[PDB]
Ligand binder design. Sequence first.
Ligand SMILES: *C/C=C1/C(=C/c2[nH]c(/C=C3[NH+]=C(/C=C4\NC(=O)C(C=C)=C4C)C(C)=C\3CCC(=O)O)c(CCC(=O)O)c2C)NC(=O)[C@H]1C
Ligand SMILES: *C/C=C1/C(=C/c2[nH]c(/C=C3[NH+]=C(/C=C4\NC(=O)C(C=C)=C4C)C(C)=C\3CCC(=O)O)c(CCC(=O)O)c2C)NC(=O)[C@H]1C
Lengths: 313, 313
Amino acid sequence: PFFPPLYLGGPEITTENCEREPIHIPGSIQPHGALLTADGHSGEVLQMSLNAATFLGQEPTVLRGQTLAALLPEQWPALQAALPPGCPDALQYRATLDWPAAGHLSLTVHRVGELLILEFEPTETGPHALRNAMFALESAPNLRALAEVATQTVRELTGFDRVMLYKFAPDATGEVIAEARREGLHAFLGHRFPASHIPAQARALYTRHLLRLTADTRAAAVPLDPVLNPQTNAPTPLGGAVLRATSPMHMQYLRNMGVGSSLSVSVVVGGQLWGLIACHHQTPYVLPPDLRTTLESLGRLLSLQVQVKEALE
Amino acid sequence: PFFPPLYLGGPEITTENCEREPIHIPGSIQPHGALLTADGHSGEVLQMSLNAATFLGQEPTVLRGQTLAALLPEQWPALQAALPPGCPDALQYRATLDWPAAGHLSLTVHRVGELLILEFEPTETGPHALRNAMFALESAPNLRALAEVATQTVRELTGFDRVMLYKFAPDATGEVIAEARREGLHAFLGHRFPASHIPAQARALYTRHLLRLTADTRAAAVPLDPVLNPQTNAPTPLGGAVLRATSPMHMQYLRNMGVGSSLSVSVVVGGQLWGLIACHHQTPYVLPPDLRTTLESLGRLLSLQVQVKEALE
Ligand SMILES: *C/C=C1/C(=C/c2[nH]c(/C=C3[NH+]=C(/C=C4\NC(=O)C(C=C)=C4C)C(C)=C\3CCC(=O)O)c(CCC(=O)O)c2C)NC(=O)[C@H]1C
Ligand SMILES: *C/C=C1/C(=C/c2[nH]c(/C=C3[NH+]=C(/C=C4\NC(=O)C(C=C)=C4C)C(C)=C\3CCC(=O)O)c(CCC(=O)O)c2C)NC(=O)[C@H]1C
């Protein structure tokens, strides 16, 4: 069971009490994007990240309380129809928007209960990157080859300095069973780590929401304002949002290992977390949203490939 | 065993001898695109579709014999490295090019032996269209729901007037086991058709090359010039090229049914052709290349979903 978050009086996290960090409701996002929350019926913007004006151009009073119909006239109908009430919180609506700064602005929306959650992030491969990846994965003759091709493909698509396939045992310990990495990196292949390293609430979350990342492992989180959802007077659930602030405890872990940027995709087999495609980069790194989607798609393929090959082997 | 094609003295196809039509080497393409073939080592353009100048702007003598290095300076290195000798003929290199006509020009390249085959077609959704489709497919509780969600998803992505899941029995007859269609269309759900309707050489081809289409079921094919590959003095294999001319026999079948446009993706399970996602539209229709890729990706997911669910059921 969760502690309250730090902003509701909850205690600071330590190595004893880390299984109980409410990692899904940090009340803050990562600084490479902005986030808004809005009413699912009326489209009124209820919360905003304090950096919203940097990405959107409007002010924290000009936005807060306004309707998405007024803010995003072209997207609102399509968005509302894509994410109707009662839908899965994993369902997403994505669109590209123009802004005064060069390039585009990616918008990704999901719904959790009565709330819509809108994530904005800059954008400046595709479906065909994946399509060649599928062939690679499909022709692999055994699980070892599959695991290897999987990590080699992901690294080719992403440029990540380390890409690992991390498989869980029934006791929640994990083993790096395949690894693609930059020449000269110290190898993690075959190493096992304790269950505590990806604690129980994280694993549970990773079964429902299949991709998470830390763009910059020393970047300070940007709070949401107001911190609590006015609909509920409870914390906003950020589990389905990639801009969700990462556990400081995990960021510390990453920095200690010399990791500037991190990303993992879940491999989920029979509704169980089977393992992770776990990636590191030496520097801060923002993976473009369309590459992330591709990775999610690859995770679901690998999950099925694994399920099939494990049944035959 | 195949007849020679019509341009090597082979006989015209009839309802008796249709299992033997060399559908993989028509020596011609569909008119909504252009095609070139080039040497895999030197990049010299060896064959061209007679309509090449319409899509490329150069003349049939200015192109024929020129190197891709000279014609596509930006793509040639990446292309050559993506498709090295000995690779699978299903592997593809895709890029977008600019041209004097509005919009882009899509280039798709594959290699068969010593030959590179370049397909050019106009372009004026994505990876995230697929990503929501995967969720739909994944949550289906049984094969019937899977089949239905599959056809409903494909139709949503494509707008096709009829989308069918067509499952083969061991005798090569097929049954439409799920169907999404425009309101008021006559239903094919549950109907069985004879093995002759998708003859043996077609099924064999569909096991290796997983998507084919007829953009316009009364459009006349555009020949390749020279018709034979100068490397081999034999026909050019067009099995891996979507612009490949469709069997006139099949086009006739389509027109008789009132189908202006057709597309199917293979569902391949344990190296066997399990069925097809088979689509019709009332009018001529060019599906954008990035939507086609997405469909291919969906076919490979459905194949795995089917394999897993059939093992459990
Ligand atoms: C006392 C708490 C601890 C702790 C908490 C923690 N860890 C995560 C998330 C992850 N931990 C991961 C572990 C590894 N990455 C590696 O490279 C290796 C080994 C080579 C390991 C064992 C991983 C992969 C994750 C997933 C996130 C990612 O991909 O970066 C969380 C949850 C983070 C979040 O989602 O906010 C938490 C709370 N880890 C510990 O080691 C102890 C100190
Ligand atoms: C004597 C030869 C015949 C013949 C040849 C033929 N058929 C195909 C390809 C296809 N036939 C298909 C059959 C159907 N489409 C449907 O909608 C239904 C039923 C509702 C059926 C039975 C299909 C789906 C294909 C795949 C191509 C596509 O998706 O359009 C070929 C090969 C075409 C090519 O790839 O060039 C050939 C040679 N069909 C006959 O009925 C007899 C006359």
